[PDB]
Amino acid sequence: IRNKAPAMEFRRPSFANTEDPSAYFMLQKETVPLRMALAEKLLTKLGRKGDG
Amino acid sequence: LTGYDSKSSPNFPNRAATRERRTVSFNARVARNKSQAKKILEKADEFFARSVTMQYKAFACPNGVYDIQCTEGTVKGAAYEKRAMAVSAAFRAKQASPAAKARALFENRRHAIIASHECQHEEDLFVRFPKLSAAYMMGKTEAMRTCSRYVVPDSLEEEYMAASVDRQMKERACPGGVYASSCVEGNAKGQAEQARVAALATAFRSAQKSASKTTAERYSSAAYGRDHFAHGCSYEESVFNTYPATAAAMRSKSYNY
Amino acid sequence: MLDAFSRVVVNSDAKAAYVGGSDLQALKSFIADGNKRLDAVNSIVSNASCMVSDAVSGMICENPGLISPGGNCYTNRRMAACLRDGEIILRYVSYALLAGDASVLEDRCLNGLKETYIALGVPTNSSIRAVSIMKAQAVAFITNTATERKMSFAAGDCTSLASEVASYFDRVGAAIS
Amino acid sequence: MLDAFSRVVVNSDAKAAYVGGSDLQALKSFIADGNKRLDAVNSIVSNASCMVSDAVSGMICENPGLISPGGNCYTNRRMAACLRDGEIILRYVSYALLAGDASVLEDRCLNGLKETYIALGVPTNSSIRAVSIMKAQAVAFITNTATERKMSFAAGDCTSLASEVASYFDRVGAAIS
Amino acid sequence: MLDAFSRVVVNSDAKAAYVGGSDLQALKSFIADGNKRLDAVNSIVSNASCMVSDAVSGMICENPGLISPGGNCYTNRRMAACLRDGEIILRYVSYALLAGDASVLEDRCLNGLKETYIALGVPTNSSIRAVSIMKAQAVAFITNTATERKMSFAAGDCTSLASEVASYFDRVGAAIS
Amino acid sequence: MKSVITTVVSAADAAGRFPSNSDLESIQGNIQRSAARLEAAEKLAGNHEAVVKEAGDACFAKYAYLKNPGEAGENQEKINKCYRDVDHYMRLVNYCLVVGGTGPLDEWGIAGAREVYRTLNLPTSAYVASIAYTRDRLCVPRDMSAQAGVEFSAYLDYLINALS
Amino acid sequence: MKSVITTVVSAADAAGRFPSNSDLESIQGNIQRSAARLEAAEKLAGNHEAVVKEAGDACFAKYAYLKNPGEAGENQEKINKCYRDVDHYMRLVNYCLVVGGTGPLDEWGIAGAREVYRTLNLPTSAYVASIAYTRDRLCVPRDMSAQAGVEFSAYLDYLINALS
Amino acid sequence: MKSVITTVVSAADAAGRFPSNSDLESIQGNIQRSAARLEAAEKLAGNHEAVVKEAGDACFAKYAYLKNPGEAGENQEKINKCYRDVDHYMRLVNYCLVVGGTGPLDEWGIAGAREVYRTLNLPTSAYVASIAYTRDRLCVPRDMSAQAGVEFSAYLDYLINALS
Ligand SMILES: *C(=C)C1=C(C)[C@@H](Cc2[nH]c(/C=C3N=C(/C=C4\NC(=O)[C@H](C)[C@H]4CC)C(C)=C\3CCC(=O)O)c(CCC(=O)O)c2C)NC1=O
Ligand SMILES: *C(=C)C1=C(C)[C@@H](Cc2[nH]c(/C=C3N=C(/C=C4\NC(=O)[C@H](C)[C@H]4[C@@H](*)C)C(C)=C\3CCC(=O)O)c(CCC(=O)O)c2C)NC1=O
Ligand SMILES: *[C@@H](C)C1=C(C)C(=O)N[C@H]1Cc1[nH]c(/C=C2\N=C(C[C@H]3NC(=O)C(CC)=C3C)C(C)=C2CCC(=O)O)c(CCC(=O)O)c1C
Ligand SMILES: *[C@@H](C)[C@H]1/C(=C/C2=NC(=C\c3[nH]c(C[C@H]4NC(=O)C(C=C)=C4C)c(C)c3CCC(=O)O)/C(CCC(=O)O)=C2C)NC(=O)[C@@H]1C
Ligand SMILES: *[C@@H](C)[C@H]1/C(=C/C2=NC(=C\c3[nH]c(C[C@H]4NC(=O)C(C=C)=C4C)c(C)c3CCC(=O)O)/C(CCC(=O)O)=C2C)NC(=O)[C@@H]1C
Ligand SMILES: *[C@@H](C)[C@H]1/C(=C/C2=NC(=C\c3[nH]c(C[C@H]4NC(=O)C(C=C)=C4C)c(C)c3CCC(=O)O)/C(CCC(=O)O)=C2C)NC(=O)[C@@H]1C
Ligand SMILES: *[C@H](C)[C@H]1/C(=C/C2=NC(=C\c3[nH]c(C[C@H]4NC(=O)C(C=C)=C4C)c(C)c3CCC(=O)O)/C(CCC(=O)O)=C2C)NC(=O)[C@@H]1C
Ligand SMILES: *[C@H](C)[C@H]1/C(=C/C2=NC(=C\c3[nH]c(C[C@H]4NC(=O)C(C=C)=C4C)c(C)c3CCC(=O)O)/C(CCC(=O)O)=C2C)NC(=O)[C@@H]1C
Ligand SMILES: *[C@H](C)[C@H]1/C(=C/C2=NC(=C\c3[nH]c(C[C@H]4NC(=O)C(C=C)=C4C)c(C)c3CCC(=O)O)/C(CCC(=O)O)=C2C)NC(=O)[C@@H]1C
Ligand SMILES: *[C@H](C)[C@H]1/C(=C/C2=NC(=C\c3[nH]c(C[C@H]4NC(=O)C(C=C)=C4C)c(C)c3CCC(=O)O)/C(CCC(=O)O)=C2C)NC(=O)[C@@H]1C
Ligand SMILES: *[C@H](C)[C@H]1/C(=C/C2=NC(=C\c3[nH]c(C[C@H]4NC(=O)C(C=C)=C4C)c(C)c3CCC(=O)O)/C(CCC(=O)O)=C2C)NC(=O)[C@@H]1C
Ligand SMILES: *[C@H](C)[C@H]1/C(=C/C2=NC(=C\c3[nH]c(C[C@H]4NC(=O)C(C=C)=C4C)c(C)c3CCC(=O)O)/C(CCC(=O)O)=C2C)NC(=O)[C@@H]1C
Ligand SMILES: *[C@H](C)[C@H]1/C(=C/C2=NC(=C\c3[nH]c(C[C@H]4NC(=O)C(C=C)=C4C)c(C)c3CCC(=O)O)/C(CCC(=O)O)=C2C)NC(=O)[C@@H]1C
Ligand SMILES: *[C@H](C)[C@H]1/C(=C/C2=NC(=C\c3[nH]c(C[C@H]4NC(=O)C(C=C)=C4C)c(C)c3CCC(=O)O)/C(CCC(=O)O)=C2C)NC(=O)[C@@H]1C
Numbered sequence A: 001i002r003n004k005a006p007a008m009e010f011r012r013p014s015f016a017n018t019e020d021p022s023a024y025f026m027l028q029k030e031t032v033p034l035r036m037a038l039a040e041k042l043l044t045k046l047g048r049k050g051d052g
Numbered sequence B: 001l002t003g004y005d006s007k008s009s010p011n012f013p014n015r016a017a018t019r020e021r022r023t024v025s026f027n028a029r030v031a032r033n034k035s036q037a038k039k040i041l042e043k044a045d046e047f048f049a050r051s052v053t054m055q056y057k058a059f060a061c062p063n064g065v066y067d068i069q070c071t072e073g074t075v076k077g078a079a080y081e082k083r084a085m086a087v088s089a090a091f092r093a094k095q096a097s098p099a100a101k102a103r104a105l106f107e108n109r110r111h112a113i114i115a116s117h118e119c120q121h122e123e124d125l126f127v128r129f130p131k132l133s134a135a136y137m138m139g140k141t142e143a144m145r146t147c148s149r150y151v152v153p154d155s156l157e158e159e160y161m162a163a164s165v166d167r168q169m170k171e172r173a174c175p176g177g178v179y180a181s182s183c184v185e186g187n188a189k190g191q192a193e194q195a196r197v198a199a200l201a202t203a204f205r206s207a208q209k210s211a212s213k214t215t216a217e218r219y220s221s222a223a224y225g226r227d228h229f230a231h232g233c234s235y236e237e238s239v240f241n242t243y244p245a246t247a248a249a250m251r252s253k254s255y256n257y
Numbered sequence C, D, E: 001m002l003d004a005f006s007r008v009v010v011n012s013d014a015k016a017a018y019v020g021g022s023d024l025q026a027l028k029s030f031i032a033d034g035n036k037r038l039d040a041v042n043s044i045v046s047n048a049s050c051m052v053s054d055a056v057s058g059m060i061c062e063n064p065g066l067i068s069p070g071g072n073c074y075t076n077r078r079m080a081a082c083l084r085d086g087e088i089i090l091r092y093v094s095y096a097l098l099a100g101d102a103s104v105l106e107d108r109c110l111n112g113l114k115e116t117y118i119a120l121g122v123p124t125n126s127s128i129r130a131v132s133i134m135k136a137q138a139v140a141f142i143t144n145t146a147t148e149r150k151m152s153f154a155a156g157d158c159t160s161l162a163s164e165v166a167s168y169f170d171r172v173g174a175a176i177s
Numbered sequence F, G, H: 001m002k003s004v005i006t007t008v009v010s011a012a013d014a015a016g017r018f019p020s021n022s023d024l025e026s027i028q029g030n031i032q033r034s035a036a037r038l039e040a041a042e043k044l045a046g047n048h049e050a051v052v053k054e055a056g057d058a059c060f061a062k063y064a065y066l067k068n069p070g071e072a073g074e075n076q077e078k079i080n081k082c083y084r085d086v087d088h089y090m091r092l093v094n095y096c097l098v099v100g101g102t103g104p105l106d107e108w109g110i111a112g113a114r115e116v117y118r119t120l121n122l123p124t125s126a127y128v129a130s131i132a133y134t135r136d137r138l139c140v141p142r143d144m145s146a147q148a149g150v151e152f153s154a155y156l157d158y159l160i161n162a163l164s
Helices: A037-043 B023-030 B035-055 B080-092 B099-115 B120-128 B130-143 B158-169 B191-199 B201-207 B211-215 B217-225 B234-240 C002-010 C024-030 C034-045 C048-062 C077-099 C103-110 C113-120 C124-142 C159-175 D007-012 D024-032 D034-039 D045-060 D083-087 D091-099 D129-142 D159-175 E004-010 E024-028 E034-045 E048-062 E076-086 E088-099 E113-120 E129-142 E162-174 F023-031 F038-045 F056-060 F076-093 F103-110 F124-135 F148-156 F158-163 G004-014 G021-033 G035-045 G048-062 G076-099 G103-109 G125-136 G153-163 H004-008 H010-014 H023-045 H048-054 H057-062 H076-086 H090-096 H148-160
Strands: A004-010 A025-031
Touching: A004 C034, A004 C077, A025 C002, A037 C048, A037 C077, B035 B120, B035 B130, B080 B191, B099 B120, B099 B130, B099 E113, B099 G004, B120 B130, B120 G103, B191 B201, B211 B217, B217 B234, C002 C077, C002 C103, C024 C034, C034 C048, C034 C077, C034 C124, C034 C159, C048 C077, C048 C124, C077 C103, C077 C124, C077 C159, C103 C159, C113 C124, C124 C159, D024 D034, D024 F038, D034 D091, D034 F023, D045 D083, D045 D129, D045 G153, D091 D159, D129 D159, E004 E024, E004 G004, E004 G076, E024 G035, E034 E088, E034 E129, E034 G021, E048 E076, E048 E088, E048 E129, E048 F158, E076 E088, E088 E129, E088 E162, E088 G004, E088 G021, E129 E162, F023 G004, F023 G021, F038 F148, F056 F076, F056 F124, F076 F103, F103 F158, F124 F148, F124 F158, F148 F158, F148 G021, G004 G021, G021 G035, G035 G048, G035 G076, G048 G076, G048 G125, G076 G103, G076 G125, G076 G153, G103 G153, G125 G153, H004 H010, H004 H023, H023 H048, H023 H090, H023 H148, H048 H057, H048 H076, H048 H090, H090 H148
Parallel strands: none
Antiparallel strands: A004 A025
């Protein structure tokens, strides 16, 4: 149990006050990854090199 | 269907008359085709009696080295008399009373089912083979040191708690004021004291166990008498829980001792 | 079926469960104002990746010493581990909105975060300053008073759930205070 | 041996009197949570693999000198026999829970462990650190606040159940002191 | 050993199949009559010392030669051994009634008992009348037709076990003679 | 002393394991009987000083050979101590209805009873009279309920089947 | 078979006694629990092929390394054996619900399963990851009662704390 | 412990006879390997510090998923702990090849080994990738003579036939 988290999806019904079979909702547990790609574009846009 | 009919085989048992025949021809016709499986299941359980007496000596010889538990000799040739006394009495116990025959059988089919802790394959073997259950008890009750030679007292009172039960346990040996043939020292001119001279050697060096060998045997004997004699007798469990030599010298079999 | 929903997270191995068209009516009969509630938690998880980016950058924008050498937002794998953790609260406080209670938020996420962060060298006063951005960010999405993006809802009030999530972020804040 | 049904019959053998409507009301309430007591050992037997496991790692991550050269649990002959030392005290405590008293525990196993432990050289000082690792995880699975495994029970109060399991483990330190 | 619930799955283990609603309904009626089954074995254990002391003189009232000199039942010990022989083969049929299957007496009491009676010279023409006498007393207790004892039972029929108790008695004498 | 749930845990360490799933199925069943049996303990509790002297002189109404000397029942304080000997058999038969099983019965009512009643020549047939004198008058819809009425006698005849 | 009926007759047989009424309380606990236990087994007999396929897909999702050569999932014939190895468990979990005890599990599937899995290099870490996925995504009011969702799920984690 | 001397000195005492002349023939066979086995002990004792790395790196090439979470190599401490782990097994082959038997291994290395690996979830098949890599590495011309190549390679094959 380290960087583990829920993850949820929402598809609402299409029109109001009508029953919709397509409306569905995930509650899958998923480990949040390290995400190195947008870590580079956020450190370079704000400060300096970050290469210690 | 196979042929024009299906008659029974002439190799099937109980096929002839046996009504007004001679004694020689009566016994020939009742044991017609039964002799094979009587001798199949006679070498079966004797191999079972030879197999579990091997599987408990592996604890007696851990990783290929012999411990202080084997020790069949102490002086020059001190196993030759132990060779005779173990095999001459094994014939003496095969000429016992006909009351002790099934008393040995039905009690071996009592304690082994308790000690085999709920394994349905194992209790099915113990009911068909009486030699296996005679070997299951004395192997396991000597693997875990529980009978008489290793549960030494540590207090001063426990030597009489031993002595109170055993001479009352030997109500099973003497039927009345006569003795029995089941409790015999020996039958040679030195074999009486030759049973004593080993009997003090086996008690002495077995009091030289390690600290692990005594502290693991003082709880195995307690739960042993807690599921062989005192099934609900909490007073007998009140001495069986803290004083384990009481819970060990009392023997689960009708050993005629 | 919230207890069966809670066992997807708490059971210490990842499973999956989903809700079809029949048992969506089971959720609306169970949870009070669930059409206001499921609109609310959808409006946090749909824009969470923007929400973690402004939360760490406003921590830089009012404290630029984190990106200094020797700082805790230096050496970009260390900067990535902020961005991992910054949604982990928002993954779990969205789940606190869904279950209606922050018990599963407490033991799985908040429990031990105070002693972990002083073990690793995390400045704790910036860590309350990061989550207080995300406290202000969620109530602009639940009330739909966000400046940049807006979402589509049926009309009504959702200020009880805006106060309900504001009682969840200070549980994150007082755990690391 | 004797249960909480018999615990008032412990006193009643030495009364020269009986137990009737004078003491059944203390036993009547034991039935009213008799479903609860059978529901609160179903958590203890549900995690038998981990409770002896993380206990013996709970002292390694605090006092690691016990596996050093000059250790009591040095080789695998010792520490595999340490996990059997720590599992059978999880065994005779769960027999005591269904009985309501320590009559099973205090005479079958713990009747004088200071002639089998000081006779071996077992470290008593971190044995009680190996006790409260399991006590703190016993009260944590009685409540549904274990951060890893959530359990589906009927709602209600179990503080009398959570305080009782702490009052079983206390005399274990008394049996080794 | 092998009770009624174990019997219904051990003949289904060789099927390599599951146990669904084809034969569970025959077992669901077994637990329906289980309240009547506990209302059957109560009527056997309650009158044990009469009915074992009954047939040991009811055997010799038909055959007075068993008390004659040179008799099998002649002395005090051979009768004292006969009475303790007497309730063993009736405590085991009570086990078969309480467990619903005959697989506890035919492996621990009928396991070669015609083997041992030939080794002692115990007669078998008397040993089957001595259990048929103790058989009709067992259907005159589960069906309340005893003339000196009445057990208050609810209104219902007890031919469900009247042939079934005697089914645990005719297998006794058949495999000991 | 063997009751419903101290037995199934005496066998649970006899294999060396934990409680199973059927180990808890046993403890549900006395909860099904911890109301129908505790009423039968209460009926003996608030009536025991009426039944000690009721079934006490019942056996003295049977055996006239105790009323002449040559017995241990000559004088008054023996018969007073006889009514003491009644009270012990009602003290522990009240106990078994509290715990469910035959626990207190086998210890001090059943085991060891042979020596101090046969070498002491106080006949066991004289005891089973007053035991059955309590058993032959269970007024089932009056004194208790219908299920307490059948299991109260089931503990009464335990000393019948053991001692006689 | 270690059922509650066998454990109370084996202690009854060892004491040389009759069936006492202390064991009869435990039989009363069966017929209360048997209705909330058999429909956990009846729903398992009609859902076994759909649950055993859905179990093994998380075995290869948590540990996807078994498709490598030298592992236990390199070719199709032993991935077919993996579903057979795990169907045999979830049949013995069905068998032990009908008995009521843990009898068929600890004797047929469990006893001897340790020294053959490390023999043939099979980890038990993937065995317990197959049923823990089965034991989790099963809503206690949606499929069966609130009692069978307790009792049957108490049998699945019996495997996990005997294998680990 | 197991050696040439202590094994054969046991049966002299355990049968109760003197030192024979057959056990005197047995220590003579220990002289023929005394200058033939001990060259491998001083070999590896000055060689482990570079082969604890390349045989510690040998298993993670086979099993990269130990670096993978929820596995034996979930975290660095087991491997850093993990490198200290493998420096106890062939720390004992320096103790085994100096004595003449498997004494330091059958009493300190395998006794209780399968029980601390099932509970603590250490995969035993990575030790088969750890020190049997050194069996596939060993060069009889370069490193050491073929007498170590028949005796150091033998004691390793004792261990893989023990941890499996
Ligand atoms: C010898 C000539 C001779 C006898 C002695 C006597 C014995 C006997 N009794 C039965 C039948 C029963 N015995 C029963 C046992 C008891 N009856 C009770 O009421 C109490 C509880 C208990 C004694 C403590 C019962 C219930 C019966 C059935 C009813 C009945 O009384 O008939 C038999 C069996 C007869 C047969 O073989 O079918 C015998 C031998 N009878 C004698 O003839
Ligand atoms: C300095 C370099 C710097 C800051 C200071 C900080 C600015 C800042 N902005 C907010 C508020 C919000 N951020 C929001 C997030 C988003 N808006 C969107 O529409 C997209 C989906 C997403 C990412 C861009 C939202 C909704 C708000 C609230 C409304 C608003 O727009 O203001 C805060 C927190 C509130 C506060 O000021 O206390 C801060 C600190 N970012 C910087 O880069
Ligand atoms: C330890 C418990 C032992 C096992 C296992 C085993 O098989 N033998 C034990 C150890 C042992 N004993 C010997 C030698 C003898 N043992 C003797 C007694 C047996 N001979 C008999 O006729 C009987 C009656 C059934 C018994 C028990 C005798 C005699 C000897 C020979 C003594 C002598 O003078 O040589 C040995 C050495 C033999 C061997 O190589 O195994 C060992 C190891
Ligand atoms: C299975 C359903 C049981 C069970 C089996 C185990 N038995 C173990 C050891 C063991 N078993 C026996 C009896 C068996 N061995 C035989 O040779 C024969 C017949 C000739 C039988 C019936 C013996 C004698 C032993 C001791 C082995 C030895 O001395 O080395 C065993 C290992 C643990 C142990 O030693 O007890 C198991 C798992 N046990 C169970 O748990 C289930 C219920
Ligand atoms: C437990 C106390 C039971 C109980 C059991 C009975 N034992 C009977 C005879 C008997 N039992 C033993 C072993 C036991 N008696 C002891 O004194 C000790 C320990 C010091 C133990 C373990 C022996 C040696 C004997 C022989 C007779 C004698 O004691 O002199 C017995 C009578 C039947 C029989 O003889 O087999 C019973 C019922 N007795 C009880 O009341 C509680 C419930
Ligand atoms: C990677 C190479 C392995 C692996 C190794 C780990 N072992 C861990 C702990 C551990 N290992 C042993 C066995 C070994 N160490 C010893 O000290 C002795 C006896 C002298 C032996 C045979 C033991 C006994 C222990 C526990 C105590 C200790 O740490 O020494 C370990 C850390 C896990 C933990 O204990 O928390 C690792 C990573 N693990 C793997 O997954 C592969 C197979
Ligand atoms: C960035 C805005 C912060 C900051 C963040 C860091 N967190 C680091 C490690 C870390 N965080 C957590 C908590 C979170 N991750 C999870 O997986 C779970 C629950 C399952 C939670 C609640 C954990 C558990 C860890 C790492 C330890 C572990 O794996 O168990 C981290 C890395 C530290 C380092 O590399 O030295 C950083 C930088 N730190 C900051 O300074 C700002 C304020
Ligand atoms: C609160 C943060 C919002 C807001 C919420 C309201 N939604 C209302 C009705 C409504 N909401 C949804 C979507 C929701 N229901 C679902 O089943 C799912 C997905 C599974 C979601 C996301 C629907 C479909 C409806 C019904 C629409 C219709 O009638 O066609 C609503 C009205 C009261 C109520 O029904 O609860 C409110 C107040 N509206 C707001 O103003 C704030 C910003
Ligand atoms: C059939 C699906 C079985 C099976 C049958 C075999 N039986 C074999 C030999 C054999 N069988 C009997 C018993 C049979 N003969 C009778 O007279 C009666 C009843 C009155 C019966 C049931 C006997 C006596 C013999 C010996 C041969 C003989 O006497 O004629 C047999 C082997 C024949 C051979 O050895 O060549 C088989 C294969 N075996 C099976 O695999 C399934 C279970
Ligand atoms: C529970 C809190 C979740 C949930 C998960 C879903 N399960 C779905 C299908 C499904 N579930 C099981 C396990 C259960 N069924 C059984 O028959 C038995 C044992 C007898 C158990 C424990 C199975 C075997 C299946 C497959 C049957 C099928 O084809 O549906 C399911 C439907 C699939 C999907 O739409 O993704 C879901 C969502 N169900 C819930 O309502 C909550 C969210
Ligand atoms: C406190 C630590 C817990 C909690 C406990 C409660 N459990 C309640 C009810 C309950 N649990 C079971 C299952 C248990 N009894 C058995 O007989 C068996 C196996 C044979 C097991 C596993 C049952 C049957 C029940 C009663 C439900 C019913 O009979 O329909 C419960 C409600 C009863 C009460 O309040 O007294 C509570 C409070 N619940 C919690 O929330 C905490 C965490
Ligand atoms: C046939 C053998 C009898 C007969 C039997 C019936 N008994 C019925 C009900 C009943 N019996 C008991 C007591 C029983 N349950 C226990 O738990 C224990 C001991 C622990 C015992 C001895 C109870 C509690 C009940 C249920 C009635 C109630 O709850 O008060 C019964 C009616 C139920 C049914 O038919 O299924 C019958 C027919 N009755 C007869 O006519 C013969 C003589
Ligand atoms: C029941 C089968 C008859 C019946 C008989 C009568 N008994 C009368 C008095 C009486 N009854 C008992 C036994 C009862 N008292 C208890 O405390 C307990 C157990 C806890 C039991 C079973 C006693 C000891 C006495 C004497 C004291 C008293 O007066 O109550 C009685 C009163 C008049 C008389 O006969 O002297 C009757 C008629 N009663 C019934 O209705 C059914 C027919
Ligand atoms: C699948 C998720 C597993 C896995 C399964 C494999 N099992 C293999 C062989 C095997 N398994 C068993 C135990 C199983 N067979 C039974 O009959 C019963 C119950 C009565 C059980 C639990 C046995 C006895 C055997 C060997 C005989 C046979 O194959 O039928 C196996 C093949 C290995 C091999 O034969 O070398 C596999 C692949 N392995 C996995 O990858 C996951 C963990």
